[PDB]
């Protein structure tokens, strides 16, 4: 597909028992400090409760990009994991605003409703990354959770499974995001 | 001048000097992808052995461009960034297409032929974007060639003399470039 072009769909996963998503809010904020903007259209899929807020063109100038990270709210708590794939894709790969896509799962948790279906539609936009967040996991053996969270990226997990146990460690795996990301040549 | 409507007019210096010649047609994909497709229109002027290629009014859609732009041969040495003006100034913002001007030199070392003349009809397309490329001189310290690519835009050289002394740099400055002409209005 196309080489650098990429579309960083964050899943915002905004969990309402997150102890404090301010560490997460400012992870994102780094993102865009090493992905280089502009050509990326990060669109911010503010899901849990919510249904997404900042589409793939709006985003004109990313010191406004910025201001929408900083005011983005958080409340939620059903994990509709293939109910987010539908909410994703479908609306992203559209002809406003087209371009290689770069799916990324920033859920919480495990998922209530099965993926199934969705692995197979998966192929149709590609780079499904799974952010292993442990947040509210943090205060139990996960255990179970881990091995839901696995199977969720399509070729090569391991590459795409970041992994996000505290909200304070995001910050750190902002980074090697955007540079794996942007080497990502495959198809 | 009006907005959304641009012509962003790219000289696509295809110097052999230019080591890899792709990541300046990988630039146009990063511009593309930021600028309003259909409205916009990046010409792919390759002079500098070859007598240009894609003009204004052929491509229309973002499924049009970009593998043009991949397309691309290339081809070039002697140092006649200067004429670039008759190719672009006279045979680009024709009769045949016009709309509001964007004159945008991606030149790669000096020109012999003195601008002079072709500075001042500048007026006549405006917004003549100066990217300093020196990749025959990233090896040495060019500094005259730096003094020869500073005096090239329009009033305000700064806010459009982007540098690019090594091929990684035009990646990351198209990012700027992108949001900035999204808002250009002077005149």
């Known amino acids: 597909k196309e080489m650098s072009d990429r579309v960083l ?16 809010k400012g992870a994102v904020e780094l993102l ?21 807020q900042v589409l793939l063109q709006p985003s004109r100038s990313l010191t ?5 990270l900083q005011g983005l709210p958080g409340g939620g708590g059903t994990p509709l994991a293939s109910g987010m794939e539908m909410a994703m894709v479908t609306a992203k790969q559209a002809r406003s605003r087209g371009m290689t896509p770069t799916i990324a799962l920033l859920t919480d948790g495990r998922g209530n409703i099965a993926l199934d279906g969705t692995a197979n539609r998966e192929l149709a936009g590609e780079q499904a990354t799974k952010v292993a967040r442990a947040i509210r996991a ?9 091995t839901a969270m696995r199977p969720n990226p399509a070729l090569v997990d ?23 990301l942007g080497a990502a040549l495959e198809a």
């Open 9 to 24: 769909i964050f899943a915002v996963d905004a969990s309402g028992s997150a102890a404090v998503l301010s560490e997460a």
């Open 64 to 68: 406004q990009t910025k201001r929408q």
């Open 32 to 52: 865009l400090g090493r992905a280089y903007a502009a050509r990326d259209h990060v669109s911010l899929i503010t899901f849990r409760g919510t249904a997404a």
């Open 138 to 146: 943090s205060g139990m053996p996960a255990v179970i959770i881990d």
């Open 158 to 180: 391991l590459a795409r499974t970041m992994d996000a146990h505290y909200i304070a460690l995001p910050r750190a795996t902002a980074h090697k995001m955007a540079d794996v």
